Amino acid sequence: TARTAPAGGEVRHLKMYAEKLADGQMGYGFEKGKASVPGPLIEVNEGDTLHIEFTNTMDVRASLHVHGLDYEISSDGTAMNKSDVEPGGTRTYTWRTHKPGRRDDGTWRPGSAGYWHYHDHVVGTEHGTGGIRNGLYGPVIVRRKGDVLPDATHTIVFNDFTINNRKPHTGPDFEATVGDRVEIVMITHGEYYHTFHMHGHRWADNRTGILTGPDDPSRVIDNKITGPADSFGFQIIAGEGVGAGAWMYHCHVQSHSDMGFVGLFLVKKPDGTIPGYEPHEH
Amino acid sequence: TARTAPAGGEVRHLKMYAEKLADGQMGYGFEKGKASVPGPLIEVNEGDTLHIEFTNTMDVRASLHVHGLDYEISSDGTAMNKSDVEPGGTRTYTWRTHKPGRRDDGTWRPGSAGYWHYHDHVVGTEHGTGGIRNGLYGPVIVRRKGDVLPDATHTIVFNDFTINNRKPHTGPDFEATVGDRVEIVMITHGEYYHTFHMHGHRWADNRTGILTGPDDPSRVIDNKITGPADSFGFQIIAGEGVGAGAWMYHCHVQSHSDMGFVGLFLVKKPDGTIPGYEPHEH
Amino acid sequence: TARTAPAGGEVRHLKMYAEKLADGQMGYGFEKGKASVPGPLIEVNEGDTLHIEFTNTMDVRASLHVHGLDYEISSDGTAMNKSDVEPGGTRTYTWRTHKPGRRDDGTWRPGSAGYWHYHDHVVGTEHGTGGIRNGLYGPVIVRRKGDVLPDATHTIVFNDFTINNRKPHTGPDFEATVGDRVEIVMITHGEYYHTFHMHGHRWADNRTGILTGPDDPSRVIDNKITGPADSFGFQIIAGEGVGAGAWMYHCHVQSHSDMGFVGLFLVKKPDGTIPGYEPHEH
Ligand SMILES: [Cu+2]
Ligand SMILES: [Cu+2]
Ligand SMILES: [Cu+2]
Ligand SMILES: [Cu+2]
Ligand SMILES: [Cu+2]
Ligand SMILES: [Cu+2]
Ligand SMILES: [Cu+2]
Ligand SMILES: [Cu+2]
Ligand SMILES: [Cu+2]
Ligand SMILES: [Cu+2]
Ligand SMILES: [Cu+2]
Ligand SMILES: [Cu+2]
Numbered sequence: 001t002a003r004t005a006p007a008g009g010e011v012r013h014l015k016m017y018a019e020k021l022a023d024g025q026m027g028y029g030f031e032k033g034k035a036s037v038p039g040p041l042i043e044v045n046e047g048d049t050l051h052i053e054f055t056n057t058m059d060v061r062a063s064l065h066v067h068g069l070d071y072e073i074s075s076d077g078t079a080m081n082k083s084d085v086e087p088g089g090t091r092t093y094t095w096r097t098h099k100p101g102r103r104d105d106g107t108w109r110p111g112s113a114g115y116w117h118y119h120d121h122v123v124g125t126e127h128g129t130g131g132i133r134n135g136l137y138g139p140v141i142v143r144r145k146g147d148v149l150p151d152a153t154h155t156i157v158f159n160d161f162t163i164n165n166r167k168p169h170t171g172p173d174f175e176a177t178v179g180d181r182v183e184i185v186m187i188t189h190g191e192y193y194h195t196f197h198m199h200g201h202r203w204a205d206n207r208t209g210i211l212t213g214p215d216d217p218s219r220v221i222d223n224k225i226t227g228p229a230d231s232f233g234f235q236i237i238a239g240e241g242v243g244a245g246a247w248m249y250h251c252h253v254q255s256h257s258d259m260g261f262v263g264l265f266l267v268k269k270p271d272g273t274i275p276g277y278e279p280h281e282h
Numbered sequence: 283t284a285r286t287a288p289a290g291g292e293v294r295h296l297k298m299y300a301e302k303l304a305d306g307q308m309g310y311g312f313e314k315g316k317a318s319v320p321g322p323l324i325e326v327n328e329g330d331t332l333h334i335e336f337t338n339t340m341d342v343r344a345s346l347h348v349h350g351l352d353y354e355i356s357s358d359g360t361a362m363n364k365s366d367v368e369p370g371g372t373r374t375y376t377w378r379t380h381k382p383g384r385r386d387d388g389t390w391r392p393g394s395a396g397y398w399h400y401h402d403h404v405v406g407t408e409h410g411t412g413g414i415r416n417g418l419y420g421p422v423i424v425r426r427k428g429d430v431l432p433d434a435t436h437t438i439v440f441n442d443f444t445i446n447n448r449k450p451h452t453g454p455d456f457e458a459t460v461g462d463r464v465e466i467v468m469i470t471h472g473e474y475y476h477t478f479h480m481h482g483h484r485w486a487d488n489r490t491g492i493l494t495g496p497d498d499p500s501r502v503i504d505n506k507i508t509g510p511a512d513s514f515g516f517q518i519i520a521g522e523g524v525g526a527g528a529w530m531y532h533c534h535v536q537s538h539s540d541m542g543f544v545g546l547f548l549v550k551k552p553d554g555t556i557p558g559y560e561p562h563e564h
Numbered sequence: 565t566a567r568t569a570p571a572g573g574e575v576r577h578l579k580m581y582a583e584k585l586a587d588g589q590m591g592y593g594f595e596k597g598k599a600s601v602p603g604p605l606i607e608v609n610e611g612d613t614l615h616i617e618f619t620n621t622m623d624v625r626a627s628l629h630v631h632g633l634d635y636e637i638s639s640d641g642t643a644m645n646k647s648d649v650e651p652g653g654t655r656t657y658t659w660r661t662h663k664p665g666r667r668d669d670g671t672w673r674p675g676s677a678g679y680w681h682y683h684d685h686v687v688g689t690e691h692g693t694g695g696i697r698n699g700l701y702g703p704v705i706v707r708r709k710g711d712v713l714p715d716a717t718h719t720i721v722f723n724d725f726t727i728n729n730r731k732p733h734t735g736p737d738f739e740a741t742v743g744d745r746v747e748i749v750m751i752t753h754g755e756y757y758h759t760f761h762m763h764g765h766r767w768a769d770n771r772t773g774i775l776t777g778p779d780d781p782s783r784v785i786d787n788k789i790t791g792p793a794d795s796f797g798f799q800i801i802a803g804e805g806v807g808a809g810a811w812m813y814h815c816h817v818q819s820h821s822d823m824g825f826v827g828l829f830l831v832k833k834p835d836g837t838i839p840g841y842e843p844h845e846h
Contacts, residue, residue: 002387067786068766073809073840076763081810081840098805100778105566107712109804110768110775110784127814127821148389191818193475193757193789195509199358202350204392206781211392214382216781217488217498220392222349225475225509227759227789229816240391241380245355246363250409252511254473257409276355276363284669430671475757477791481640484632486674493674496664499770499780502674504631507757507791522673523662527637528645532691534793536755539691558637558645 002181005143008045008097016054018062018085018120018136025165026123026134028064032057037165038155039118039138041185044097046111046144052093056085061122062131066140067231068116070096077121084122097142113144114207115233117187132189135165139185141233147208150183150235152176158226158251160190161259168260175266178239182265184209185233188226195252197223198265200245201236209234223252239267246277284463287425290327290379298336300344300367300402300418307447308405308416310346314339319447320437321400321420323467326379328393328426334375338367343404344413348422349513350398352378359403366404379424395426396489397515399469414471417447421467423515429490432465432517434458440508440533442472443541450542457548460521464547466491467515470508477534479505480547482527483518491516505534521549528559566745569707572609572661580618582626582649582684582700589729590687590698592628596621601729602719603682603702605749608661610675610708616657620649625686626695630704631795632680634660641685648686661706677708678771679797681751696753699729703749705797711772714747714799716740722790722815724754725823732824739830742803746829748773749797752790759816761787762829764809765800773798787816803831810841 019035020026027035044050050069056062063084065077075093076083085091097112119137124130139155154174157164164172176182186196199222203209206218209232224232239245250262268274301317302308309317326332332351338344345366347359357375358365367373379394401419406412421437436456439446446454458464468478481504485491488500491514506514521527532544550556583599584590591599608614614633620626627648629641639657640647649655661676683701688694703719718738721728728736740746750760763786767773770782773796788796803809814826832838 002389067761068784070805071764072807073764073811076809076840078812080812083840096805100775103801107566108775108777109801110766112784114784125818125822127818129818129822132818189818193509195511197349197511200353200355202392204781205783207783208781211382211390212781213390217486217490217494217500218781219487219489219514220350220394220396223511223513225507225512225789227757227816228818229759229761229787230789231787232783237385237391241352241378243354245358247355248360248362252509254407254409254411254414254471254510258407258411276358276365284671475791477793479631479793482635482637484674493664493672495672499768499772499776499782501769501771501796502632502676502678505793505795507789507794519667519673523634523660525636527640529637530642530644534791536689536691536693536696536753536792540689540693558640558647 003149005045005145005147005149007145008047011049012044013051016052016064018056018058020058026058026131026136028136028138037135038157041139041141041153041155043141043143046097046099046113046142048097050095052095053090054085054093055090056087059087061086062136063121064093064118065121066095066116066118067229068114069112069140069142070098079122079126111144112142113147114142115185115231116140116142117231119189133160137187137189139187141185148210148235151180153183153185155185158188158194158196160192161256161261163261163263171263173264173266175268176238177268177270178244180238181235182238183233183235185231187231188228190228193225193227194256195223195225197252198247198249200242200247203234203236244269244274246274285431287327287427287429287431289427290329293331294326295333298334298346300338300340302340308340308413308418310418310420319417320439323421323423323435323437325423325425328379328381328395328424330379332377334377335372336367336375337372338369341369343368344418345403346375346400347403348377348398348400349511350396351394351422351424352380361404361408393426394424395429396424397467397513398422398424399513401471415442419469419471421469423467430492430517433462435465435467437467440470440476440478442474443538443543445543445545453545455546455548457550458520459550459552460526462520463517464520465515465517467513469513470510472510475507475509476538477505477507479534480529480531482524482529485516485518526551526556528556567713569609569709569711569713571709572611575613576608577615580616580628582620582622584622590622590695590700592700592702601699602721605703605705605717605719607705607707610661610663610677610706612661614659616659617654618649618657619654620651623651625650626700627685628657628682629685630659630680630682631793632678633676633704633706634662643686643690675708676706677711678706679749679795680704680706681795683753697724701751701753703751705749712774712799715744717747717749719749722752722758722760724756725820725825727825727827735827737828737830739832740802741832741834742808744802745799746802747797747799749795751795752792754792757789757791758820759787759789761816762811762813764806764811767798767800808833808838810838
């Protein structure tokens with residue numbers, strides 16, 4: 001009786017741009033002039049095909065490389081396989097997804113479903129080190145039929161020391177009301193390992209971050225080590241068993257949190273108030 | 283026919299102190315003058331509520347922050363939410379736990395059960411870097427009804443380069459007799475990633491460290507990467523299939539083990555002897 | 565109808581040598597003069613016993629230490645337990661394995677099955693830092709009855725910055741034809757954490773890297789953080805859903821991949837061609 005994903009299998013078309021931003025960053029967007037860091041969420045159902053008409057509006061070569069989804073070598077997004085895009089150029093990248101199922105040999109083919117991500121592979125170096133650092137990364141979600149759908153999805157990227165390329169002490173913060181079903185996509189990039197920690201909430205360390213029932217032995221956690229290009233996701237009920245509050249999330253590596261890269265999960269009562277949080281003190 | 287945890291649901295009261303130790307460390311204890319590093323184990327059943335009458339006997343502010351368990355924002359243990367404790371002060375922290383169960387929307391709420399930990403959040407920095415470094419950390423276990431109970435529980439904390447804040451070449455060692463059911467709570471703190479390795483024994487990488495039966499596909503391991511504020515636990519049968527012996531455990535990062543931070547799991551025959559281990563050579 | 569492992573339980577005998585190589589490395593082999601880095605794969609069935617007649621042909625002490633399998637303390641491979649081997653010496657190491665099963669107390673004993681590894685424990689330091697760095701490491705696979713068997717098994721070791729001790733830009737590459745069932749054993753050694761990434765393919769994060777059916781909630785991944793002495797393995801169908809191609813694998817830590825330690829999974833059509841791969845350009 002929660003909302004759930006339907007069966008997939010449609011062909012989808014989408015336009016994407018890589019742009020240099022006024023402050024020197026680089027971002028992806030669905031419209032020229034509306035690039036963001038992280039780039040926009042792409043969400044499909046297992047079985048869907050996605051044709052991305054990608055335009056590089058920058059003055060250097062750029063590409064689009066995706067984790068997890070099915071792509072032929074011509075949509076690798078690498079210079080080696082001649083899959084990047086010249087300045088001002090356009091290229092159609094195709095990502096496919098499949099449902100799980102029994103193979104002819106009796107084995108089980110896993111589906112595409114999961115929390116994934118896309119990023120540049122040619123800016124700065126042949127592994128996209130400069131593009132990733134500048135902001136060319138974004139999330140991808142592939143739903144299995146029957147997966148629970150959230151009220152809202154927030155993307156948190158640990159990129160080197162930053163969260164979502166933001167300066168220390170600037171969040172990002174996310175807001176919810178007690179009881180909302182909130183989804184988090186958690187991606188890591190760059191040079192360092194991290195440990196993602198969330199106060200007041202916990203999730204299962206498995207594909208969906210949710211336990212299906214009493215037979216799932218997955219660890220329930222509130223702290224998870226991650227490294228460059230790791231992605232996972234989960235859903236929580238905001239404030240469940242703990243109430244409204246300004247619930248911190250941050251990397252738990254002590255020098256990293258001490259740098260001031262922290263955010264708040266601001267869980268409100270219906271009247272918008274948050275116990276112990278005065279907005280004028282923030 | 284092994285002992286198992288009963289159904290929870292009782293209200294428990296406990297006193298805790300933070301104290302400066304004569305050697306400059308800081309520790310938690312259940313009694314004044316009996317602080318330890320790591321702090322004392324707290325063990326409850328899912329459904330229990332714990333009211334901790336906490337007294338800060340130090341000359342600087344200190345707090346108590348817990349992973350995993352349910353707490354309202356007023357027991358956050360952070361300065362931001364005005365949840366720390368002035369020098370000489372007292373505060374009651376409340377931790378709650380819940381059993382798993384079906385929500386009204388048909389989804390499955392995960393329970394509190396697991397291997398968790400508590401630590402300071404305000405000594406030295408606003409993330410407790412100095413308190414953690416000085417020794418203000420300890421383990422928490424939440425049992426699910428029917429969980430197997432051990433003969434004994436040992437806590438191993440990788441804190442920066444140390445084990446349990448001890449100097450190189452000083453253990454800690456733990457002792458058992460062949461056949462004992464031994465539980466390990468494994469916590470990591472500080473700045474570095476580690477890989478916990480145990481000779482002669484292995485466990486399952488899931489919630490309890492134990493496989494329930496033949497249908498659990500979890501990896502069976504003897505080596506596990508960890509990062510700051512990670513916690514996991516497991517149970518082993520001492521010497522099972524391998525016999526008595528001085529079984530090393532250590533971080534497998536080569537420069538870390540080469541520093542001499544290592545311990546021994548001393549598994550004895552009934553007569554107390556250990557093959558290949560002469561106590562006078564140690 | 566894929567090939568599967570039979571029930572184990574045989575006693576096996578094998579000879580192994582540690583040798584200094586002409587270029588200054590050190591390797592294990594099954595025959596004098598045929599040491600390799602990584603050392604040769606050892607593969608057994610749960611229940612098998614392996615007696616290894618090990619000869620150290622080097623001028624320094626060396627040993628053989630294994631993860632995961634059952635060994636008594638006399639086959640620890642450590643100097644502390646007098647289990648290493650003098651220059652020119654010989655020693656028989658015994659590794660045992662067991663099937664999973666119900667204990668007398670009603671609990672479930674996990675079997676030995678998994679992806680494991682062996683390495684030196686005394687060259688350079690008392691934890692084998694020099695031996696490991698020089699190349700004394702190799703893979704071990706223990707099969708459970710009914711496990712799916714591959715067409716071929718490839719071993720990938722992240723040893724400090726190198727792959728299999730090879731220089732940057734020298735692979736190693738592995739070849740397959742579209743449709744082959746390919747097994748990867750992935751081991752990490754040394755000082756650093758890594759993230760193993762494979763283009764165009766994905767696997768399950770569980771014991772076998774394969775989902776048994778629709779009830780397994782394990783995350784499906786193409787990127788995995790690892791640390792020193794971690795081991796895991798998986799099987800993929802070469803080119804499944806993605807076609808022939810030169811599919812990169814590499815560490816995704818950006819400075820590591822930028823050093824040029826990368827390899828190719830060269831997936832061919834039957835005529836041996838690879839789209840977008842010209843052999844003369846490589
Ligand atoms: Cu790549
Ligand atoms: Cu961090
Ligand atoms: Cu916390
Ligand atoms: Cu990537
Ligand atoms: Cu915190
Ligand atoms: Cu370590
Ligand atoms: Cu070992
Ligand atoms: Cu913490
Ligand atoms: Cu060891
Ligand atoms: Cu690496
Ligand atoms: Cu990739
Ligand atoms: Cu080892």
